[PDB]
Amino acid sequence: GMSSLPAVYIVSSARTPVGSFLGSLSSLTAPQLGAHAIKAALAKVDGLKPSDVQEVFFGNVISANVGQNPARQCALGAGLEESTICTTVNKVCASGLKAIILGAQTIMTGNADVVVAGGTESMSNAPHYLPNLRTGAKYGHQSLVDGIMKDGLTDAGKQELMGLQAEECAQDHGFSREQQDEYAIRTYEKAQAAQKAGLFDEEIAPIQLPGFRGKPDVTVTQDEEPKNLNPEKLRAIKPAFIPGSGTVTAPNSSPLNDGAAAVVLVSEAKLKELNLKPVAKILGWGDAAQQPSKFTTAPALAIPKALKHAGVGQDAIDAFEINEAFSVVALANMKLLGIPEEKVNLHGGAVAIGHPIGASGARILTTLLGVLKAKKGKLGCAGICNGGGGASALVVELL
Amino acid sequence: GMSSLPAVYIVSSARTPVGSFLGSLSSLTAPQLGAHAIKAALAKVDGLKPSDVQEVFFGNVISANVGQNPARQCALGAGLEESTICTTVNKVCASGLKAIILGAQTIMTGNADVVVAGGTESMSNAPHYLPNLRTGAKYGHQSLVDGIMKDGLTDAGKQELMGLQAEECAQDHGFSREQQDEYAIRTYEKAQAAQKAGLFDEEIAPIQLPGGKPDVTVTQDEEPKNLNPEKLRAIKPAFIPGSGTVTAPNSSPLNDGAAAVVLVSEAKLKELNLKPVAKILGWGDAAQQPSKFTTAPALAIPKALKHAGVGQDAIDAFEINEAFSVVALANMKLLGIPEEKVNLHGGAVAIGHPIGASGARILTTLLGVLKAKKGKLGCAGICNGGGGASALVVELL
Amino acid sequence: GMSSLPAVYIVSSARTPVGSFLGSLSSLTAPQLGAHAIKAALAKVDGLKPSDVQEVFFGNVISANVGQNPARQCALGAGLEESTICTTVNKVCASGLKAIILGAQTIMTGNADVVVAGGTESMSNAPHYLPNLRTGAKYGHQSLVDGIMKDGLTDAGKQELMGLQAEECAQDHGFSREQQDEYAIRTYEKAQAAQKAGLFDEEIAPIQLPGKPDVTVTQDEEPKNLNPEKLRAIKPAFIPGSGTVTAPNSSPLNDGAAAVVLVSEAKLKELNLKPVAKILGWGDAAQQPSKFTTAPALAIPKALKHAGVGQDAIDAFEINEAFSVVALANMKLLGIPEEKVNLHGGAVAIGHPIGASGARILTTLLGVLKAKKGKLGCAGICNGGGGASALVVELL
Amino acid sequence: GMSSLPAVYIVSSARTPVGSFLGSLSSLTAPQLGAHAIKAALAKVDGLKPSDVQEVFFGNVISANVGQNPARQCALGAGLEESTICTTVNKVCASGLKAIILGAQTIMTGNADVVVAGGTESMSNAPHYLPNLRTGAKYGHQSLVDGIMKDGLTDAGKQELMGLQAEECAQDHGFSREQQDEYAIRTYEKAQAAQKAGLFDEEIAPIQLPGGKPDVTVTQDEEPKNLNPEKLRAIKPAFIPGSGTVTAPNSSPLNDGAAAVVLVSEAKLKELNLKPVAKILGWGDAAQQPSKFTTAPALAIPKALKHAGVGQDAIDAFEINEAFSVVALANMKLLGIPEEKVNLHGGAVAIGHPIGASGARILTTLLGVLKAKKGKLGCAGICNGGGGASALVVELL
Ligand SMILES: CC(=O)SCCNC(=O)CCNC(=O)[C@H](O)C(C)(C)COP(=O)(O)OP(=O)(O)OC[C@H]1O[C@@H](n2cnc3c(N)ncnc32)[C@H](O)[C@@H]1OP(=O)(O)O
Ligand SMILES: CC(C)(COP(=O)(O)OP(=O)(O)OC[C@H]1O[C@@H](n2cnc3c(N)ncnc32)[C@H](O)[C@@H]1OP(=O)(O)O)[C@@H](O)C(=O)NCCC(=O)NCCS
Ligand SMILES: CC(C)(COP(=O)(O)OP(=O)(O)OC[C@H]1O[C@@H](n2cnc3c(N)ncnc32)[C@H](O)[C@@H]1OP(=O)(O)O)[C@@H](O)C(=O)NCCC(=O)NCCS
Ligand SMILES: CC(C)(COP(=O)(O)OP(=O)(O)OC[C@H]1O[C@@H](n2cnc3c(N)ncnc32)[C@H](O)[C@@H]1OP(=O)(O)O)[C@@H](O)C(=O)NCCC(=O)NCCS
Ligand SMILES: [Cl-]
Ligand SMILES: [Cl-]
Ligand SMILES: [Cl-]
Ligand SMILES: [Cl-]
Ligand SMILES: [K+]
Ligand SMILES: [K+]
Ligand SMILES: [K+]
Ligand SMILES: [K+]
Ligand SMILES: [K+]
Ligand SMILES: [K+]
Ligand SMILES: [K+]
Ligand SMILES: [K+]
Ligand SMILES: [K+]
Ligand SMILES: [K+]
Ligand SMILES: [K+]
Ligand SMILES: [K+]
């Protein structure tokens, strides 16, 4: 259903390394990470200046203490002009991909010719909340609310952590502790393999952290999590969400993480005016939702909807990015859609790379473009579930 | 601009009363206020069921402790289906209007036929933050950050409150304390006049609060009755001691509230034979230096008029959001818009400013002004911290 | 065995009004209340200058955010000389009486001739704690600890509120909810009758809160709250459904301070002071922590034996009412008839500023002795953790 | 003097290692440290059982979050009977010594024959405070108060940290940065020499910390090893930038630790045929202007000596607590006490200053100094914030 509308081209993309929780990038705020990703993306487009960017959509979930309009801070921090229109987007884990859809639509309705879209998250710098200080609590202990748990990882209706709802997925779709563990080992191995072959080198923009008080500078170059794989330890670890007989574990779940990613989108007209070389074309997209506790399999709706919107058959896709909120999320959506694992997350997924929730929808699209390049594919599809019951998906053609 | 693209119709709108800070609505969360507006807006459309809504865009600025995806909680709380696509939008004070823009665009690209959009804010329930508990602070007094100040009212680059940058507006454009106060008095008078004549009755959906106390219905905006002109002219300034021109009476307050609009495509309007209230003619976002956000509407409003193919003179009524009295004064001066065409039922200085909601709140009020004043063409413009503004042009049908 | 040691004389006493939680006195800090009672107590001794006070012992339980040495701030706030030796004492609810014992001992060992002792508590201004901020806590909800609950009202071992162990007392010694309610009503009425008769007027030093208009606080805030039928119908407070302990038949949370002025035999003679009373003896005792409620049944006999005074020769007792059941159980255990217990009401009706109550009941006891024309009094007060303190006095 | 009061004997003492701030003992609470010291001190008395202890006085300054009656928790944690009378004492840094004085007095008035006294502090586990949650604060950032700073280290009248009032001491009595620095190096050298010679082995009760982690034993004080004379003389001042003379290396640190003594009457000493370690000869408290607390020992020490019937020249060893290097220098100047008789095994600048315990810690160390150096008469003095000091004189038997 998109072919009757103006075309939207990706002319570049970039991402930070993904840092572990309280880890390599924990000194940087979410706008600093997003600015880094936006600046790096634009630096790759010869013939396009940062001052050409008219509008920004940037995902961010746990915005507490980030300050006014995280997307605007990202844009100005990146060196974009003060004239740039900036909107922050929250569709929990789908934020980064919905931001890109919104950027594409803004080109399609004629209101921009150059848009930067993506997402950022600093889970390390998510604060705690004191909820009752204005009116007071006269007597009794109080709770300091962990903002990650409250605004990122707990389903609002059932007050269940995403991890507990992944257990519901395992039960609904018949995936044992062992199948999830072997999936996680495989995705770590793919991430380590791509890392070692240099296959993330182009998409990653290393971060230089200036030393303080004479201390040496630090360059963060690679994702922090992939090296953590220890197969023997992973198979023996205790469950994370259901004691004893739980199947979901910290090793086979996505971690908490810091990172950002950005894509640069241009209209057909701007591509011709500036004689730009496009990397990919956006073919279509789809959002879908169902029962909140079944958010884990919402991609099974979004992906067919995105393929239909793009006019592409599922069998024509050369590579899928199915975001690994949990290992069981990938396994269940592959099962429901009949997609073989050999076509899914070819450079590993968020279980091994990390899951900065506001950035991951854009992070996986950046990685998808690198997969299509390295594996000489043409058609890709990215899908990512989000807490609350939804998912977003997008189809790209590598040019 | 927009005339080459599919039409988008507003088939209804609704808003909560605007409650004062820690006031009439402080017991309700932002999604409870949002659900209330959404539900009330859909109840007005004869022939459209809540299950027909496909997608929601809802503004919300200070989202700390609201929980996962405020917009999704608004939608589910309103009785929408679990299949509904929900996104929360933050463009600070322009959030509720940008949400409506994104909703219109989603109809225009063919991805939805029925969209609900608007915004909500519970400033009363914004928490305080403890920023460094994960890594620890070994020794020394720490600080608890007020979420309203940090994420709502402080410009990130300068670390200045909006009211301090409103003083910049008064100096840049030469508006005295007296000019700002008399503006504020006039907009309170217009709000009180509209209240007494029942002109907000249609747009407001009253809220029923279960009582240890009797049961309370909140039917009115809480702020308009506070006008005391003698006290207003005598009060000390709020942001610069001694020489300041900006005061709490001539500034917008902190407030709680939500507002929603229902958007449909041309095909859906015809399939269901729905009666549209208005048509969206065009919109425009603009931005400039962050500390000059006060006059970004002087950019966004011409841009939206150009997108709509409408001349500024053909507009029958404007809503220029009153972040501060000086904001309305400065944009009227720069654009050459007479005050006789501006905020005809009062603005946010008198009505309240729940920041994530106000962009949609002013559009709901504009539709009422157009009907009451027998206007056809309306334009709403709202500035936002960080240097931005958003504006929207509508035609009353 | 005090008859062979130096005699200790009470030449005066004074207390603040006792304010309700977050109530009449909640704008004052604990040292501000303490300073008020100290200065007022000294104002009644003609011929004793505040600069004559050599040493201070002052009780205080929830000292968090009060600042360095609450007792020293009380002394300096009251106008005492910077040469004054100042120690803060925490024996939970017994702090104000143990402080008086320690002051009397410092007279007896010859290290001072003029001592001020007593207690203060501002439960209103007790803070909340954030315990793991130094090392940090990486992921998960944390707790803000109510300092009243943590440092004042919870037994350290069993980790249970005092009210829950008051339920133990009701069970162990067999006192129904009805009996506890009937005792609460009797002590409220006595407090109201002493109040209406002006019998608290001399011991209370009214507090002036400057504004816009000034506010004078003259009376205890709690006694008036009595509502017999509402009291008899309220749900329990520590065990839902079957509980016998309620907020109306328990002590409240309160703010207040109290002070007494002690001198030696020699100083009394030197400046020709008129003593109000003489300390005859004291006793501290302790037993099982959850049984703290009947620890005064050990400390009251110990104090009487130390004073060389029989239990039946006592004209009035102050048995502190941590809960109504505490007074009933100690009356039952010691064979004390209620007719000579808390004749102007007790903490259930007057309030329980925990660091001050040990001195508050002694000041009230001295007033009961004058009004009822008695000579011998004994004050006993239990404290969380399992202990109790008691003191025997003779009205001169 | 105390010649007219009954005799009070010390039959044993013991202390924990002194751990650094957030250091080797940071996992232990104040009552766990106190109970450890009490239990070890009683273990040294052959013929006295723990069930024989009748009353405890225990110092503790920053008692926030420690729970009801820290002294009672120390006593029960040590295995004392539930019949033990327990009182917690706060005279700031003098707490541990005022506690011993009160325990002696309770023996002297006949109310006990066996008393345990001392003090404890876990500065590592002092919390932060939220001061106005009960009443609320409607709008604006709030402050968390560090309990160490508020309840341990700030003069209440002037709101000055102790280290700032230490500079006053340096200016009042004319001690330069260099003199304070050379003093600190000397006391670190003395602490290290005592350590290596095992002179602390008797007084210290090592602490066993369980780990599937391997178990760790803390046997030494953590601070003495930190001496770096080069860094010390070049470090920047800690309380007055630029011109200041007081530094972190020449000040006492923040620390954890506890210490205890066991006291008996003459009758109980005879009944049980106990060999006493020492006899308490006298004591004295004194106080002056709060900001001049650094020199309050110069009143308390002569007062204690007069109470004990001992001339100053008769004393074989003094413990003058090193709240700061300048504090020991000033008191040696005022009293004419040569340094050759002061803190012979080092002081709190090198050993640590767990403030609620230091008053008892220096008496434990003093008894070791008297034995090691063939002395008979010793005097400990310790100042406290607020203007006070406490001092006590003992005879080694
Ligand atoms: C909206 C959406 O997208 S839905 C999903 C959104 N995101 C989420 O829900 C986040 C899910 N993940 C989480 O909540 C957190 O990462 C948690 C709770 C699972 C982590 O729990 P933790 O116990 O703190 O994880 P942790 O990193 O400490 O690992 C625990 C153990 O597993 C070990 N381990 C971790 N990863 C591996 C690995 N690949 N291989 C072997 N061992 C591993 C660790 O070494 C550790 O062992 P140890 O502590 O005994 O030394
Ligand atoms: C301005 C602000 C700080 C209010 O501060 P405040 O001191 O708490 O304001 P108050 O409501 O207490 O009003 C103060 C006084 O003015 C009086 N007052 C308020 N409105 C009045 C009116 N219309 N007429 C006469 N008097 C009025 C009040 O009665 C009060 O009197 P008092 O001192 O005797 O109590 C706060 O509302 C604010 O920050 N507004 C800006 C919000 C914002 O920036 N939004 C984003 C914009 S881009
Ligand atoms: C027991 C305790 C938790 C009370 O909690 P609380 O319910 O908040 O106390 P309140 O004053 O609010 O009482 C609540 C109700 O009781 C009523 N009430 C209280 N005292 C009353 C009285 N004398 N007569 C009639 N009604 C009374 C109140 O009117 C109120 O009614 P409401 O439900 O309409 O509000 C608290 O006061 C406490 O812990 N006291 C013990 C203190 C202590 O342990 N000290 C140390 C002992 S060792
Ligand atoms: C003085 C005080 C503020 C310490 O400040 P601090 O800077 O946080 O402590 P530090 O350990 O970091 O010391 C600062 C520097 O001096 C170094 N240092 C400490 N002891 C040293 C020593 N003996 N030799 C050489 N260097 C030393 C430290 O290694 C550190 O060096 P760095 O800058 O390279 O890290 C704190 O300990 C204090 O307030 N003490 C007074 C306690 C008190 O008042 N008690 C009551 C008295 S009445
Ligand atoms: Cl959703
Ligand atoms: Cl902006
Ligand atoms: Cl006890
Ligand atoms: Cl003092
Ligand atoms: K470029
Ligand atoms: K690169
Ligand atoms: K993992
Ligand atoms: K309807
Ligand atoms: K209506
Ligand atoms: K106003
Ligand atoms: K007098
Ligand atoms: K009086
Ligand atoms: K009561
Ligand atoms: K023994
Ligand atoms: K030893
Ligand atoms: K030091």
* Residue B129: burial class (beta carbons within 10 Å; 0-12, 13-18, 19+): buried
**Residue B75: helix, strand or coil by DSSP?**
helix
How far apart CA B205 and CA B223 sit, in angstroms, is 17
Q: What's the one-letter identity of residue A187?
A: T
Q: Tell me, yes or no, if D383 is annotated catalytic.
A: yes
**Residue C390: helix, strand or coil by DSSP?**
strand
CA neighbor of C157 nearest in space, from C287, C290, C354: C290
How far apart CA D82 and CA C285 sit, in angstroms, is 10
Angle B161-B162-B167 from CA coordinates, rounded to 5°: 100
Strand partners, A14: A262
How far apart CA B360 and CA B381 sit, in angstroms, is 11
**Residue B44: helix, strand or coil by DSSP?**
coil
DSSP letter at C137 equals: -
| Residues comprising chain B, all counted | 397
* Residue C229: burial class (beta carbons within 10 Å; 0-12, 13-18, 19+): exposed
How far apart CA C378 and CA C316 sit, in angstroms, is 7
Query: Are the CB atoms for C219 and C344 separated by under 8 Å?
Result: no
Angle, helices C70-77 vs C30-43, to 10°: value is: 50
Query: Are the CB atoms for B180 and B170 separated by under 8 Å?
Result: yes
> A159 — phi, psi (to 5°)?
55, 40
Angle, helices A162-173 vs A327-337, to 10°: value is: 40
CA neighbor of C203 nearest in space, from C89, C369, C51, C70: C369
Strand partners, B120: B258
Say if ligand 4 is within 6 A of residue D251 CB.
yes
D316 half-sphere exposure, CB direction, 13 A CA radius: 16
Distances (CA, A) of B118 to B12, B148, B260, C236, D55: 12, 20, 4, 47, 70
How far apart CA B118 and CA C265 sit, in angstroms, is 83
> D209 — phi, psi (to 5°)?
-110, 110
Residue to probe by mutation, ligand 1, list A121, A162, A238, A328, most atoms within 8 Å of CB:
A162
Angle B271-B276-B282 from CA coordinates, rounded to 5°: 110
How far apart CA B322 and CA B314 sit, in angstroms, is 22
Query: Are the CB atoms for C362 and C262 separated by under 8 Å?
Result: no
| Nearest CA-CA distance, residue D396 and chain B, Å | 41
CA neighbor of A114 nearest in space, from A12, A28, A24: A12
Strand partners, B279: B9, B395
The two tokens of residue A346 are 């070819």
How far apart CA D296 and CA D283 sit, in angstroms, is 14
Cα A306 to chain center, whole Å?
Answer: 17
Kindly calculate the radius of gyration of chain B based on its CA atoms and give it in whole angstroms: 20
Ligand 15 centroid – CA C116 distance (Å): 13
Angle B99-B100-B105 from CA coordinates, rounded to 5°: 100
CA neighbor of A186 nearest in space, from A338, A336, A349: A349
Residues with C-beta less than 6 Å from any ligand 2 atom: B 93, 153, 162-163, 188, 226-228, 231-232, 235, 238, 248-249, 251-254, 323, 353, 355, 385
For A100-115, letters b (16+ CB in 10 Å) and e give: bbbbbbbbbbbbbbbb
| Nearest CA-CA distance, residue B131 and chain C, Å | 11
DSSP letter at B237 equals: P
DSSP string covering B159-224: TEEHHHHHHHHHHHHT--HHHHHHHHHHHHHHHHHHHHTTTTTTTB--EEE------EEE-S-SSG
H or E segment to which residue C283 belongs: strand C277-286
SS (H, E, C) chain D: CHHHCCCEEEEEEEECCCEECCCCCCCCCHHHHHHHHHHHHHHCCCCCCHHHCCEEEEECCCCCCCCCCHHHHHHHHCCCCCCCEEEEEEECECHHHHHHHHHHHHHHCCCCCEEEEEEEEEHHHCCEEECCCCCCCCCCCEEEEEHHHHHHCECCCCCCEHHHHHHHHHHHHCCCHHHHHHHHHHHHHHHHHHHHCCCCCCCECCEEECCCCCCEEECCCCCHHHCCHHHHHHCCCCCCCCCCCCCCCCECCCEEEEEEEEEEEHHHHHHCCCCCCEEEEEEEEEECCHHHHHHCHHHHHHHHHHHHCCCHHHCCEEEECCCEHHHHHHHHHHHCCCHHHECCCCCHHHHCCCHHHHHHHHHHHHHHHHHHCCCCEEEEEEEECCCEEEEEEEEEC
Q: How determined? A: X-ray
Residue whose pair of structure tokens reads 């940008």 in the numeric block? B98
| N-term to C-term CA, chain A | 20
How far apart CA A320 and CA B257 sit, in angstroms, is 42
How far apart CA A351 and CA A16 sit, in angstroms, is 17
H or E segment to which residue C392 belongs: strand C387-395
DSSP letter at B34 equals: H
Residue whose pair of structure tokens reads 């639509």 in the numeric block? A105
CA-CA-CA-CA torsion sign (C41, C45, C48, C54): negative
CA neighbor of C149 nearest in space, from A141, D145, D135: A141
Distances (CA, A) of B370 to B94, B260, B303, B375, D258: 21, 18, 21, 4, 78
Q: Tell me, yes or no, if C344 is annotated catalytic.
A: no
Residues in Cβ contact with D234 at an 8 Å cutoff, skipping those fewer than 6 apart = none
Query: Are the CB atoms for B69 and A388 separated by under 8 Å?
Result: yes
Query: Are the CB atoms for C160 and C154 separated by under 8 Å?
Result: yes
**Residue B12: helix, strand or coil by DSSP?**
strand
Query: Are the CB atoms for D340 and D320 separated by under 8 Å?
Result: no
The two tokens of residue A257 are 């993480």
**Residue C214: helix, strand or coil by DSSP?**
coil
> B179 — phi, psi (to 5°)?
-60, -40
How far apart CA B8 and CA A399 sit, in angstroms, is 34
Of all residues in chain A, the one with the smallest CA distance to D135 is A136
The two tokens of residue A248 are 């979901």
H or E segment to which residue C89 belongs: strand C85-90
How far apart CA B77 and CA B95 sit, in angstroms, is 20
The two tokens of residue A102 are 């919104």
Query: Are the CB atoms for B6 and B108 separated by under 8 Å?
Result: yes
Residue whose pair of structure tokens reads 């409620």 in the numeric block? C293
CA neighbor of B149 nearest in space, from B171, B134, B169, B129: B129
Distances (CA, A) of D25 to A56, C217, D30, D112, D351: 52, 48, 10, 33, 14
Query: Are the CB atoms for C71 and C86 separated by under 8 Å?
Result: yes
The two tokens of residue B215 are 């049961």
H or E segment to which residue C33 belongs: helix C30-43
Q: What's the one-letter identity of residue D285?
A: D
**Residue C377: helix, strand or coil by DSSP?**
strand
SS (H, E, C) chain A: CCCCCCCEEEEEEEECCCEECCCCCCCCCHHHHHHHHHHHHHHCCCCCCHHHCCEEEEECCCCCCCCCCHHHHHHHHCCCCCCCEEEEEEECECHHHHHHHHHHHHHHCCCCCEEEEEEEEECCCCCEEECCCCCCCCCCCEEEEEHHHHHHHECCCCCCEHHHHHHHHHHHHCCCHHHHHHHHHHHHHHHHHHHHCCCCCCCECCEEECCCCCCCCEEECCCCCHHHCCHHHHHHCCCCCCCCCCCCCCCCECCCEEEEEEEEEEEHHHHHHCCCCCCEEEEEEEEEECCHHHHHHCHHHHHHHHHHHHCCCHHHCCEEEECCCEHHHHHHHHHHHCCCHHHECCCCCHHHHCCCCCCHHHHHHHHHHHHHHHCCCCEEEEEEEECCCEEEEEEEEEC
Residue whose pair of structure tokens reads 């910390």 in the numeric block? D209
B240 half-sphere exposure, CB direction, 13 A CA radius: 16
DSSP letter at B16 equals: P
Residue to probe by mutation, ligand 2, list B228, B294, B320, B326, most atoms within 8 Å of CB:
B228
CA neighbor of D55 nearest in space, from D29, D95, D77, D88: D88
CA neighbor of D207 nearest in space, from D357, D33, D70: D33
Residue whose pair of structure tokens reads 């040696």 in the numeric block? D332
Chains that touch D (3 or more CB pairs under 8 A): A, B, C
* Residue B352: burial class (beta carbons within 10 Å; 0-12, 13-18, 19+): buried
Ligand nearest to the CA of C350: 17
**Residue C15: helix, strand or coil by DSSP?**
strand
How far apart CA D274 and CA D27 sit, in angstroms, is 36
How far apart CA A248 and CA A380 sit, in angstroms, is 29
CA-CA-CA-CA torsion sign (A355, A361, A363, A364): positive
Closest Cα to atom 11, ligand 2: which residue?
Answer: B248
Ligand nearest to the CA of D148: 4
The two tokens of residue C149 are 């609950």
**Residue C69: helix, strand or coil by DSSP?**
coil
For the stretch C229-237, contacts whose Cβ atoms lie closer than 8 Å and that sit 24 or more positions apart, written own/partner, are C231/C181, C231/C184, C231/C185, C232/C181, C236/C177, C237/C163
DSSP letter at C273 equals: -
The two tokens of residue A25 are 């990038």
How far apart CA A8 and CA A278 sit, in angstroms, is 10
Closest Cα to atom 23, ligand 1: which residue?
Answer: A250
Query: Are the CB atoms for C303 and C390 separated by under 8 Å?
Result: yes
- Option in B144, B150, B388 nearest A130 (CB): B144
Cα A336 to chain center, whole Å?
Answer: 22
| Residues comprising chain D, all counted | 397
How far apart CA A85 and CA A75 sit, in angstroms, is 9
**Residue B119: helix, strand or coil by DSSP?**
strand
Task: Write out the catalytic residue numbers of A.
Answer: 93, 355, 385
Count H helices, E strands: chain C? 12, 14
CB atoms within 10 A of CB B230: 7
Distances (CA, A) of B41 to B13, B26, B54, B262, B364: 5, 22, 15, 7, 10
The two tokens of residue D101 are 């004085």
Q: What's the one-letter identity of residue B190?
A: K
Give the pairing of strands A142-146 and A128-130: antiparallel
Q: Do B137 and C142 touch (CB under 8 A)?
A: no
CA-CA-CA-CA torsion sign (C275, C280, C285, C290): negative
SS (H, E, C) B301-344: HHHHHHHHCCCHHHCCEEEECCCEHHHHHHHHHHHCCCHHHECC
How far apart CA D141 and CA B161 sit, in angstroms, is 13
Q: Domains (ranges, CATH) in chain D?
A: 1-128+199-280 (3.40.47.10), 157-198+281-394 (3.40.47.10)
Q: Do B133 and C142 touch (CB under 8 A)?
A: yes
How far apart CA B305 and CA B313 sit, in angstroms, is 10
Count H helices, E strands: chain B? 12, 16
How far apart CA B41 and CA B364 sit, in angstroms, is 10
Query: Are the CB atoms for A248 and A239 separated by under 8 Å?
Result: yes
CB atoms within 10 A of CB B217: 10
Distances (CA, A) of A285 to A294, A301, A395: 21, 12, 6
Q: Where in chain B does DSSP place strands (E)?
A: 8-15, 19-20, 55-59, 85-90, 114-122, 128-130, 142-146, 154-155, 160-161, 207-209, 216-218, 255-265, 278-287, 317-320, 377-384, 388-396
CA neighbor of D147 nearest in space, from D171, D130, D172, D162: D130
The two tokens of residue A321 are 């990015």
Q: What's the one-letter identity of residue A135?
A: T
Q: Do C82 and D55 touch (CB under 8 A)?
A: no
The two tokens of residue A17 are 């390394």
